[PDB]
Structures are given as C-alpha cells and as structure tokens.
Design an enzyme around this catalytic site. Structure first.
Site, PDB file in Angstrom:
ATOM      1  N   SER A  45      35.781   5.541  43.614  1.00  0.00           N
ATOM      2  CA  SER A  45      35.747   4.290  43.983  1.00  0.00           C
ATOM      3  C   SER A  45      34.271   3.817  44.316  1.00  0.00           C
ATOM      4  O   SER A  45      34.394   2.483  44.634  1.00  0.00           O
ATOM      5  CB  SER A  45      36.773   4.135  45.355  1.00  0.00           C
ATOM      6  N   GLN A  47      47.791   2.786  44.058  1.00  0.00           N
ATOM      7  CA  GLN A  47      47.477   3.166  42.872  1.00  0.00           C
ATOM      8  C   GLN A  47      48.355   2.538  42.053  1.00  0.00           C
ATOM      9  O   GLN A  47      49.462   1.864  42.273  1.00  0.00           O
ATOM     10  CB  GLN A  47      48.034   4.654  42.800  1.00  0.00           C
ATOM     11  N   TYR A  83      43.519  -1.752  50.953  1.00  0.00           N
ATOM     12  CA  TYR A  83      42.506  -1.208  50.072  1.00  0.00           C
ATOM     13  C   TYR A  83      43.645  -0.714  49.072  1.00  0.00           C
ATOM     14  O   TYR A  83      44.701   0.072  49.025  1.00  0.00           O
ATOM     15  CB  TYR A  83      41.855   0.186  50.506  1.00  0.00           C
ATOM     16  N   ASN A 107      43.592   0.220  44.405  1.00  0.00           N
ATOM     17  CA  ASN A 107      42.994   0.328  43.172  1.00  0.00           C
ATOM     18  C   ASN A 107      43.470  -0.954  42.158  1.00  0.00           C
ATOM     19  O   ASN A 107      42.864  -1.326  41.297  1.00  0.00           O
ATOM     20  CB  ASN A 107      43.199   1.615  42.339  1.00  0.00           C
ATOM     21  N   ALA A 117      35.716   8.741  45.863  1.00  0.00           N
ATOM     22  CA  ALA A 117      36.360  10.125  45.387  1.00  0.00           C
ATOM     23  C   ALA A 117      37.069  10.165  44.123  1.00  0.00           C
ATOM     24  O   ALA A 117      38.021   9.112  43.652  1.00  0.00           O
ATOM     25  CB  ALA A 117      37.026  10.846  46.521  1.00  0.00           C
ATOM     26  N   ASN A 144      35.466  16.887  46.591  1.00  0.00           N
ATOM     27  CA  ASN A 144      36.123  15.755  47.427  1.00  0.00           C
ATOM     28  C   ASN A 144      36.275  16.340  48.830  1.00  0.00           C
ATOM     29  O   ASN A 144      37.298  16.857  49.146  1.00  0.00           O
ATOM     30  CB  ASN A 144      37.664  15.340  46.763  1.00  0.00           C
TER      31      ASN A 144
HETATM   32  O1  LIG Z   1      41.435  12.436  40.405  1.00  0.00           O
HETATM   33  C1  LIG Z   1      41.760  11.394  40.065  1.00  0.00           C
HETATM   34  O2  LIG Z   1      42.365  10.805  39.058  1.00  0.00           O
HETATM   35  C2  LIG Z   1      41.351  10.119  41.114  1.00  0.00           C
HETATM   36  C3  LIG Z   1      41.301   8.897  40.479  1.00  0.00           C
HETATM   37  C4  LIG Z   1      41.098   7.961  41.411  1.00  0.00           C
HETATM   38  C5  LIG Z   1      40.880   8.062  42.848  1.00  0.00           C
HETATM   39  C6  LIG Z   1      41.077   9.323  43.237  1.00  0.00           C
HETATM   40  C7  LIG Z   1      41.223  10.319  42.180  1.00  0.00           C
HETATM   41  C8  LIG Z   1      40.689   9.255  44.593  1.00  0.00           C
HETATM   42  O3  LIG Z   1      40.836  10.243  45.447  1.00  0.00           O
HETATM   43  N1  LIG Z   1      40.445   7.863  44.888  1.00  0.00           N
HETATM   44  C9  LIG Z   1      40.305   7.660  46.322  1.00  0.00           C
HETATM   45  C10 LIG Z   1      41.163   6.387  46.885  1.00  0.00           C
HETATM   46  C11 LIG Z   1      42.635   6.934  46.434  1.00  0.00           C
HETATM   47  C12 LIG Z   1      43.272   6.573  45.277  1.00  0.00           C
HETATM   48  C13 LIG Z   1      44.377   6.837  44.998  1.00  0.00           C
HETATM   49  C14 LIG Z   1      45.255   7.874  45.873  1.00  0.00           C
HETATM   50  C15 LIG Z   1      44.524   8.283  46.814  1.00  0.00           C
HETATM   51  C16 LIG Z   1      45.200   9.218  47.710  1.00  0.00           C
HETATM   52  C17 LIG Z   1      44.821   9.853  48.782  1.00  0.00           C
HETATM   53  C18 LIG Z   1      43.493   9.804  49.193  1.00  0.00           C
HETATM   54  C19 LIG Z   1      42.796   8.538  48.333  1.00  0.00           C
HETATM   55  C20 LIG Z   1      43.414   8.080  47.364  1.00  0.00           C
HETATM   56  C21 LIG Z   1      38.738   7.267  46.754  1.00  0.00           C
HETATM   57  O4  LIG Z   1      38.201   6.917  45.866  1.00  0.00           O
HETATM   58  O5  LIG Z   1      38.338   7.648  47.832  1.00  0.00           O
HETATM   59  C22 LIG Z   1      40.533   7.188  44.094  1.00  0.00           C
HETATM   60  O6  LIG Z   1      40.214   6.063  43.986  1.00  0.00           O
END
Ligand SMILES: O=C(O)c1ccc2c(c1)C(=O)N([C@H](Cc1cccc3ccccc13)C(=O)O)C2=O
Length: 358
Positions: free
Chosen positions: A61, A117, A147, A149, A315, A340
C-alpha cells in the site's frame, strides 16, 4: 558517515529485526536532504542472497503514494478534476448510488464504504463493472473514511483515462522516468529478477499475487535508493522541473479530510508536527487504520503543510514497508522489509530515529 545517524539507526533497527524475526531489511535516512543507507540480512534465504541497495521490495500500500501523485499530476495537467463525478469517466456506471460520488471520494476512501479488497472473484472488466454497479454504500458520500484498495484503486484507473495511457504507462512516463526512479516497477522485468527479494510469510517464500486494480492500490516494487529519491522528491517538490509533477506532489499532500489528529491526502496521510508519538504509533495499528471513522471536510483543502509528519504504511503477504518525512526539517525515512510485521513496530522505530535526528 556521520556517527549519530549510524548509531541511531543501528540501535533502533537491530532489536527490531531480532524481535520481529525479519529476514532482510533496507533503511534509508534522509538527513538535511541527503540519503544514508543501511542493509541487513537476506533477500533470498535459500540462495543466500543478501539485501543490497539494489534489492527490490514489494511496497504494498505504499504504492498508493505513487497513485496519489499520479492523480495529482493529471489534475495539474487539466485532464481530471477531483470534483468530477465518477460517472464522467465511467459512463457504464449507471447505478443511482453513484450520484454524488466524486473522484475525491474515491481517492480518499470517503465514497461511503467501498470495501478494503476488491473480491478475488472479480477478474474481468465485466466482473469489475458488475462489482461497482452492485455495491451498496453504508454511508452518504464524504461522511465516513474506510481505508480501501477498491476505492483508491478505482481512482487510479479513472485518473489516467483521459490520457489514453494504461495506468502502468502513465506511471512510468509521468512519475518514475521524470524522477529517475529507474529501478521502480509495477511489473518487475526479467532483467531485474535477480534483485527481486522473496517475501516471507510463515517461513514460506511468497510474492504478491495478481488481482484486480493491483497496480493502482498495492503493485509497486522498488529499491531503497529509489524510495529514498521518492522521499526527497516529496520533501522538496519545488526542485522538480516537470511542472505538472511538482504540482501533483503538492496536491497529494493537501489536507482533504480530518479524522482524529490525522489528515487524508491523496495516498499520503499527514499529522501536524510535532506529533504525539503515541498517536501515530497506536493509530498505525490496523485496529484503528482499517476502521470506519467519521470525517470532517476541510473546505477548501489546506495546501501541503511543511510542519507535517507525512507518512504511509504498506504491506503485502510477505513484505512490510513504511515511509515518513517532515518537510520542515528536510528529514525522512524509508524502511523496507521482506516480512509483514506489525505497523506500530515500524512507526515506533521510525519515530525514535527521526526524533533523535530532529
Ligand atoms: O499479499 C497480497 O496479495 C496483498 C496484497 C495487497 C495488500 C496486502 C497483501 C496487504 O496486507 N495489504 C495491507 C492492507 C490490507 C488489504 C487487504 C486485506 C488486508 C487484511 C488485513 C490487513 C491488511 C489488509 C497493507 O498494505 O497494509 C494490502 O494492501
């Protein structure tokens, strides 16, 4: 290279790596505008490849900062307006719940409850249309921040439509190339595969999977050098010679909404400097960061404030990144890791480092 920076960084990051079991990490400190680099551990444990200044990490992100600036650049070019209806750029989006949902709302997670998501089952363009057509808001536009995506992902896709460029082509030509981010990628080319770190989740090597609107929300991979240069560019946009990009950077750090002590930019989030460290540290926890929260409209938005802590956590399954900077102080940090690990550990480390150097 100045002992204070060395000691402050090592005394903070060593215990962090130890406590969090991080396989590999790269850190850049920008101090009086100049970068200092630090590396630890492994990009690929099995093949014994060390983390170097050329290692690519998944930003997750943190990618949204690029999307925000690319959006800002399109505004500066007169291609889009944040005040425009989403439907101006997607005429097939005819469902009445979209009346009054603007590109601003998409960019800032305030459309009224677009999900974290995009569903995994959404693969095709027809699937995407169906998803947004069938989505029902929980809240009126511009009243709650959630927040998502699916929110800024759509913004990114629509923002580049008038250009005729694909999102990746627009990002390459309008952001990466002008800023000489020559080892920053939406899709890692074969030439650079040797530098692409594995992410590690539960001890398994993993890379981010393809998904709808991935490029726009979480798809950028970069090196510690390029990310330091990204921080430098956002610290001092007036040094950027491409006028629309300079303006885009400034638009991304404008304050559109407030919730608690945080301000929502385009991709970037900001707080007034000096910050309450407890507030940014605890606030970074995805207990708070992913929660629906009421927003106060900033009418009109405040231009980029120099006395700000400007930052973004990000992450993927196998990576954890954090970027923060303080324009007022010419001070910033980038922390890239191929695990992560929890947000608050990142922000705590960053605070300790920057506070000691401020
Ligand atoms: O491994 C993947 O396919 C993946 C893709 C996108 C994100 C993530 C993993 C991911 O952990 N994040 C988080 C935000 C996030 C997006 C979607 C679901 C999540 C579930 C639990 C925590 C954070 C999430 C971030 O950027 O902090 C994402 O935006």
């Amino acid at each position: 290279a100045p002992q204070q920076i060395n000691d402050i960084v090592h005394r903070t990051i060593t215990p962090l790596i130890e406590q969090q079991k991080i396989p590999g990490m790269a850190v850049a400190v920008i101090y009086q505008g100049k970068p200092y680099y630090f590396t630890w551990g492994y990009a690929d444990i099995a093949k014994k490849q060390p983390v170097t200044q050329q290692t690519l990490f998944e930003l997750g992100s943190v990618s949204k900062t690029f999307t925000g600036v690319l959006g800002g650049d399109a505004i500066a070019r007169g291609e889009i307006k944040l005040s425009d209806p989403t439907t101006k750029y997607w005429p097939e989006l005819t469902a009445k719940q979209w009346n009054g949902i603007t590109l601003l709302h998409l960019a800032t997670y305030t459309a009224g409850g677009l999900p974290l998501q995009v569903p995994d089952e959404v693969k095709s363009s027809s699937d995407l249309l169906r998803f947004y057509q069938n989505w029902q808001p929980a809240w009126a536009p511009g009243t709650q921040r959630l927040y998502a995506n699916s929110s800024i992902g759509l913004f990114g896709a629509l923002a580049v439509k008038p250009s005729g460029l694909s999102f990746e082509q627009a990002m390459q030509t309008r952001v990466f190339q002008p800023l000489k981010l020559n080892h920053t990628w939406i899709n890692v080319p074969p030439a650079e595969e040797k530098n692409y770190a594995w992410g590690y989740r539960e001890g398994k090597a993993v890379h981010v999977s393809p998904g709808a609107l991935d490029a726009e929300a979480y798809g950028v991979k970069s090196t510690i050098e390029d990310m330091a240069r990204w921080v430098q560019s956002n610290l001092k946009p007036l040094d950027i010679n491409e006028k629309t990009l300079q303006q885009g950077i400034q638009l991304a750090q404008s304050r559109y909404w407030q919730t608690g002590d945080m301000y929502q930019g385009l991709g970037w989030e900001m707080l007034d400097w000096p910050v309450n460290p407890d507030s940014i540290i605890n606030g970074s926890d995805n207990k708070i960061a992913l929660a629906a929260r009421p927003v106060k409209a900033i009418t009109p938005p405040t231009p980029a404030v120099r006395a700000s802590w400007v930052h973004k956590t990000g992450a993927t399954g196998g990576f954890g990144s954090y970027v923060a900077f303080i324009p007022e102080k010419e001070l910033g940090i980038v922390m890239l890791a191929n695990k992560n690990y929890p947000n608050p550990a990142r922000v705590d480390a960053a605070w300790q480092i920057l506070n000691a150097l401020q």
